[PDB]
Amino acid sequence: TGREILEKLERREFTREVLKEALSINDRGFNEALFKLADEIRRKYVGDEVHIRAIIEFSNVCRKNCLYCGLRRDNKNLKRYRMTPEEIVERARLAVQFGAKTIVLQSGEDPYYMPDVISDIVKEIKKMGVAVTLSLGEWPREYYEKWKEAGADRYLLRHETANPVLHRKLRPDTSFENRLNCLLTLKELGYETGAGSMVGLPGQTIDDLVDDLLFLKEHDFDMVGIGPFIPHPDTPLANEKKGDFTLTLKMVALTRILLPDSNIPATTAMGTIVPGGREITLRCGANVIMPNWTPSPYRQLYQLYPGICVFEKDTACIPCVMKMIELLGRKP
C-alpha cells in the first residue's frame, strides 16, 4: 500500500519504480502524507523563510517557436514590447527599495539585448549589492561568460522535459541535447543553476515525470521550477488539456524530498489554475515566491500562458506576498 512507498522515500530509497508508484497512487491519505512529508522536509532543511525574488519580464520578443509558449515567434496577435535599459534598472531599483535581495531578469530570446546590453544592466543592478538571476534562454557560451563577468549570480533554464523526443517535438528550434548542454555550461561557469519542467504536456506520461524527477536528483540543481502546462489560445496547443494541479503538486513535493536543500518556487502557473495554488504549494515543499515587478502595460503583454496580479498596482504585489507569507506562518 501507500505506506510502503512512503517509508522508502524516508529511507531515501529513490528508484524508478518507487517514484512511478508515488506519482501513480491517487489515494487522498497517501497524497496528504506525501505533502506533510515534504512540508516537514522543507521545514527541516530550508527553514521557514520564504525567499522573495522579484522578477522583471523586460521583453516578450522571442526568436524561437516553442509550441506551448505564447511568445513563440509565430504568435502574430500578441503585441510585442521591449523595455529600455534605463527602465529595467529603475525598475530593479524600485524592487530593491521594496526589500528584494534577488533580481530575476527574464525574457523571450531577444537578440537586441545580447550580450552587451545584458552586461550593462547587470553591472548597474549589481551596484546595489543584490543577487542577479538571469533567465534568457539558450545562448552561446561566450554570452554566458560575459554575463558572469558582469556580476550575474544565478541562471534559470528549465529543462522543460527530459524526454528527448517530446522535447524536440515541443521545441523545434533546439533539442534536449542542447538544453542539457547549456545547463552544464552554466554550472561549469560558476552560475547557480535552476532547472525544472512543465507537468501535463500533451504526450507526457507518468514515466516522463519520473524521468524529470531522476534527471533533477542526478544533477542536484540549486533551484527547480515546476508548473502545470497552461494552453495558450494562440498556439498549436491552444485546445490541449491544462496540467493537473494535484499531479503538479506531487511533482513539487517529490522534488523537495529528492532535493531537500533546493530552492523551489511556488510558480504563478500554480496560482493561476487553482485559486490559492501558490499558497498550497508553499505548504507542500516550496520555499520561494517570485513577485512580478514587470510594469504595466508590458506585464499584460508577457503571455507565456494567459494569467493573477494583472490588475493590481505595479507595486502593491510585494506587500501582498508579505501578507500571504505572514498568514502562512512563515518569514520573508
Ligand X SMILES: C[C@H](CCC(=O)NCCC[N+](C)(C)CCCS(=O)(=O)[O-])[C@H]1CC[C@H]2[C@@H]3[C@H](O)C[C@@H]4C[C@H](O)CC[C@]4(C)[C@H]3C[C@H](O)[C@]12C
One-character DSSP codes across 172-219: TTS-HHHHHHHHHHHHHTT-EEEE-BEES-TT--HHHHHHHHHHHHHH
- Do the beta carbons of residue 291 and residue 313 sit within 8 Å? no
Residues 126-155 that bind ligand SF4 (CB under 6 A): 137
Q: Which part of the chain contacts ligand SAH (CB under 6 A), choosing from 35-43, 225-233, 285-293, 323-331? A: 225-233
Calpha distance 307→273 (Å, rounded)? 9
The entry of ligand X, Cl ion, ligand SF4, none that residue 274 binds, CB within 5 to 8 Å by partner kind: ligand X
C-beta of 256: minimal distance to ligand SF4 in Å?
Answer: 25
178-181: long-range contacts, CB 8 A cutoff, minimum separation 24 = 178/138, 179/138
Among 41, 62, 223, 322, binds ligand SF4 (CB under 6 A): 62
Question: Is residue 304 part of the contact set for ligand SAH (CB under 6 A)?
Answer: yes
Other Cβ atoms closer than 10 A to 174: 17
The entry of Cl ion, ligand SAH, ligand X, none that residue 161 binds, CB within 5 to 8 Å by partner kind: none
What's the grid cell of residue 167? Answer: 522535447
C-beta closer to ligand X: residue 136 or 273: 273
Chain centre to alpha carbon of residue 161: 13
C-beta closer to ligand SAH: residue 215 or 305: 305
Task: Please indicate if the annotation marks 284 as binding a ligand.
Answer: no
Site string for ligand SAH, 8-27 (x = CB under 6 A): --------------------
C-beta of 265: minimal distance to ligand SF4 in Å?
Answer: 16
The entry of Cl ion, ligand SAH, ligand SF4, none that residue 268 binds, CB within 5 to 8 Å by partner kind: Cl ion
Question: Is residue 157 part of the contact set for ligand SAH (CB under 6 A)?
Answer: yes
Question: Is residue 15 part of the contact set for ligand X (CB under 6 A)?
Answer: no
- Do the beta carbons of residue 229 and residue 198 sit within 8 Å? yes
What's the grid cell of residue 115? Answer: 550580450
C-beta closer to ligand SAH: residue 221 or 229: 229
C-beta closer to ligand SAH: residue 31 or 106: 106
Task: Please indicate if the annotation marks 62 as binding a ligand.
Answer: yes
Task: Please indicate if the annotation marks 182 as binding a ligand.
Answer: no
* DSSP code of residue 80: P
Site string for ligand X, 17-56 (x = CB under 6 A): -----------x--xx--xx--x-----------------
How are the residues of the chain apportioned to helix, strand and coil, as percentages rounded to the nearest 5?
A: 45, 15, 40
- Do the beta carbons of residue 134 and residue 147 sit within 8 Å? yes
Among 176, 191, 221, 229, binds ligand SAH (CB under 6 A): 229
Calpha distance 172→274 (Å, rounded)? 30
C-beta closer to ligand SF4: residue 72 or 148: 72
C-beta closer to ligand SAH: residue 196 or 295: 196
User: What are the residues whose beta carbons fall under 8 Å from the beta carbon of 157, sequence distance 6 or more?
Assistant: 135, 137, 138, 179, 182, 183, 186, 193, 194, 195
Question: Is residue 319 part of the contact set for ligand X (CB under 6 A)?
Answer: yes
Calpha distance 100→143 (Å, rounded)? 26
Calpha distance 74→65 (Å, rounded)? 7
Task: Using CB under 6 A, list all residues that contact ligand X.
Answer: 28, 31-32, 35-36, 39, 97-99, 245-246, 249, 274, 280, 283-284, 318-319, 322-323, 326, 332
